[PDB]
Amino acid sequence: GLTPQELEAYGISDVHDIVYNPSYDLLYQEELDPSLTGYERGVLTNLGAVAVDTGIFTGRSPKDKYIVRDDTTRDTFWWADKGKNDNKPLSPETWQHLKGLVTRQLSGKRLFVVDAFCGANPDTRLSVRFITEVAWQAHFVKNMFIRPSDEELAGFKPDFIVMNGAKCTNPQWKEQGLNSENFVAFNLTERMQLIGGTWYGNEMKKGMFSMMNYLLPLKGIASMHCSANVGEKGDVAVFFGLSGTGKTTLSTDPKRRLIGDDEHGWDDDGVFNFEGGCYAKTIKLSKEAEPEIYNAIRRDALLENVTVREDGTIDFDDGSKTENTRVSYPIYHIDNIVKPVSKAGHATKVIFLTADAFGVLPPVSRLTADQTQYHFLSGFTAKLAGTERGITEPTPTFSACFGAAFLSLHPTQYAEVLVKRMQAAGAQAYLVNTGWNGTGKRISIKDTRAIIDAILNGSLDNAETFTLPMFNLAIPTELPGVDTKILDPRNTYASPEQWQEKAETLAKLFIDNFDKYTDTPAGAALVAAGPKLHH
Ligand SMILES: Nc1ncnc2c1ncn2[C@@H]1O[C@H](COP(=O)(O)OP(=O)(O)OP(=O)(O)O)[C@@H](O)[C@H]1O
Ligand SMILES: [Mg+2]
Ligand SMILES: [Mn+2]
């Protein structure tokens, strides 16, 4: 695929061993090499999958994310210093120092080079070349990106390079005004991502997602943090939501063909996956509740940060290394998928998932057109942050478009293209609370799946509704397979008064958050679709 001389063109010198397009069999034996030390080491589990520890980082490091500010990006990027976001500006000169750190780190090493695609469609996909010195990092990108055919490899021409220098750090970070010795940096003039300090594989996956989020909407294509699936009739659904809200869990549905679990575009022909694999959360994983995900954990899946007992069994309940235990697998580890290309027609059902730790929002509501835009821009979820200290400190997150950490353009640009696509398809939107109600427990997966079924088969559209105060959400009066009591969140408190107190707290949070969008005529008009609180 490439010679040591081609790598020298990238700045990487004296590479003696090049592993181009490593096979799954080679990656397995690389990860289990008994002479490996530290965080490169894998262990074989009784399910047949290799498990690794990703080091000090067990999630992304948004405080270390930087984008070079130059004549290509200055007037188009959504900059952190010009709404809150992580797109912090970096100079071209400082970029050159970070590039030197990474290229020197990879020089004189045995390198894995993985060529892959981001985007299922040839007309808009990125041809990405990933370079790493850690086998399980190469395995991660083999699982998560689209694996080219032999014919596509023969004429592969990268238009983005990702250089993973996890083992290096930046000793000049203080004088350079950066956050730490680690860095995840992007340059759209050179079309490159550099990683230093963090080994975490998802920096590469979400890094390329951020690049698609820059390029696609500028060409009229929606770029979405959502899962997607399709029914027997060809009816497509997309599921937006922040991390942990259910996109992967609920899209992996035995009644539907999976398109993808996390990153999709929506062009003139329909909805298409960016990825070649899925990246499931494994904390407290239940084979009974999530059988398809559980079954995908086998040879060629890559487990991250799980606890493996001495006998090789996995303690999926153990969050000691992190609550964000994960498994990646190529998408064909799921039985019922769209193939050979992960794409389908236009979505007619658009589901916003949220996990409301305030216990206010109903399990399901059908949204008006204006409420759809209001809630898309708000991008709400919440967490019980204080659990380890024995308290419910519901902590809100408002992350525009249900994925602000990955947005490269202003939120209104994603909203505009999404609305355009939804209006052309006649799509309807729904808000689903996969989180908490007055019981202080999350709604069960079984009940949420039944809610999703009722959305997808048209049942919910055919129901009578009542209106929830404050948020003015249309809720169905009944739904097949779900206890009617929980459809109204007020019923899970000893009295509507307990819900009302929490609803007022949450409404104020939404109203304060939305204020930043009211600087345009269209945004000010959307306030009427948000929660109403005047006392
Ligand atoms: N009612 C529910 N619906 C969906 N998931 C639930 C529910 N109750 C508990 N869970 C748990 O919530 C988590 C949902 O995580 P999931 O991996 O689907 O999130 P995600 O939206 O795909 O996030 P990410 O974008 O970070 O991958 C899982 O751990 C799942 O078992
Ligand atoms: Mg997911
Ligand atoms: Mn995600």
The CA distance from 132 to 143, in Å, is 15
Question: Which candidate in 61, 124, 227, 248 is catalytic?
Answer: 248
Residue 511, classed as helix, strand or coil, is helix
What is d(CA 14, CA 165) in angstroms, rounded to the nearest whole number? 16
Q: 250 alpha carbon to ligand 2 midpoint, in Å? A: 10
Which of 185, 184, 335, 376 minimizes the C-alpha distance to 253? 335
d(C-alpha 73, C-alpha 186), whole Å: 11
Ligand 3 centre to CA of 337 (Å) is 19
Ligand whose nearest atom lies closest to the CA of 281:
1
Q: Please tell me the distance from the alpha carbon of residue 317 to that of residue 283, in angstroms, as a whole number.
A: 6
CB-count burial class (<10 Å; 0-12, 13-18, 19+) for 11: middle
Hey, what are 307's tokens? Answer: 């606890």
Q: At what angle do helices 411-425 and 369-378 cross, to 10 degrees?
A: 150
- Is 534 annotated as catalytic? no
CA 21 to chain centre: 25
CB 112 within 8 A of CB 19: yes
Question: What are the binding residues for ATP?
Answer: 206, 225, 241-249, 290, 326, 442-443, 448
Q: How far apart are CA 124 and CA 265, in angstroms?
A: 10
For the chain, the straight-line distance linking the first and the last C-alpha, in angstroms and rounded, comes to 66
Residue 466 in tokens: 């009542």
**Does 326 participate in catalysis according to the annotation?**
yes
Give the SS3 label for residue 180: coil
| CB burial readout 386-401, b (16+ within 10 A) else e | eeeeeeeebebbbbbb
The residue whose CA has the least distance to atom 15 of ligand 1 is 244
What is the atom index within ligand 1 of the atom nearest the CA of 250? Answer: 4
* Minimum-distance ligand 1 atom for the alpha carbon of 262: 25
Active site residue 206: yes
Specified resolution (Å): 1.4
Q: What is the DSSP letter of 148?
A: P
Nearest ligand by distance to the CA of 324: 1
- Determine the 3-state secondary structure of 428 from DSSP: strand
Binding site per annotation, positions: 60, 142-143, 145, 200, 206, 225, 241-249, 262, 276, 290, 326, 442-443, 448
Active site residue 225: yes
Binding residues for Mn(2+): 206, 225, 262
Is 262 among the residues known to form the active site? Answer: yes
Q: 280: CA distance to ligand 1 center in Å?
A: 8
Q: Which atom of ligand 1 is nearest to the CA of 239?
A: 21
Domains of the chain (ranges; CATH) run: 1-37+63-220 (3.40.449.10), 38-58+277-334 (2.170.8.10), 221-276+337-531 (3.90.228.20)
Evaluate whether 454 touches 480 at the Cβ level (below 8 Å): yes
Residue whose CA lies nearest to ligand 1 atom number 31? 285
The verdict on whether 490 is a catalytic residue reads no
Q: How was this structure determined?
A: X-ray
What residues flank ligand 1, with Cβ below 6 Å? Answer: 241, 243-250, 262, 279-281, 283, 434, 442-445, 448
Tokens linked to 265: 């575009």
